Amino acid sequence: SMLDDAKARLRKYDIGGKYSHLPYNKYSVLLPLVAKEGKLHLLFTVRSEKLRRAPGEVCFPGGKRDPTDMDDAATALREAQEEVGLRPHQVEVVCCLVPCLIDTDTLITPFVGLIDHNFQAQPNPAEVKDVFLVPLAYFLHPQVHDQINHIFEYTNPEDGVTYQIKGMTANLAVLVAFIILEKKPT
């Protein structure tokens, strides 16, 4: 099936816990995969205008590890629950992708999660201004704009709203699309 095929591809890129103990400032992100209308989509958040870092920008759910978290996957799930109301029984964490190094002292660990078909997002307005889906295939032929620095523009055909996706978020989206969609019979 489509979902069994996705998880089997993703598992080949799992680095597991190999880099998780190193002494960094630690953050995790959840890359949430949703099946709709026969195809896979990624779920994104628009950050609230009130936040200090990157107000109004597109990112994946996530945040800073705290002393309650059992492991880095726990950080990503705690934060996803707080931001969009995703409950633990509604996500299967399939793997841990390559971590992102920034600012010389920070390590961001990305997890890919498969989302239950009955989940519906409940954006928390203190943290999240908007939630939207993008079909995974978009990231193989994006609409690119140069600010020189590459920015993707995605327009939702439901309502005509345009979103800008850039930086680490855009880089991880492309990576997941390659893993799952490369070399597939039609």
Ligand SMILES: COCC(=O)Nc1c(C)cc(C)cc1C
């Ligand atoms: C200080 O925590 C780091 C951070 O960026 N947090 C955060 C992230 C990652 C995503 C969303 C949607 C909302 C928040 C508050």
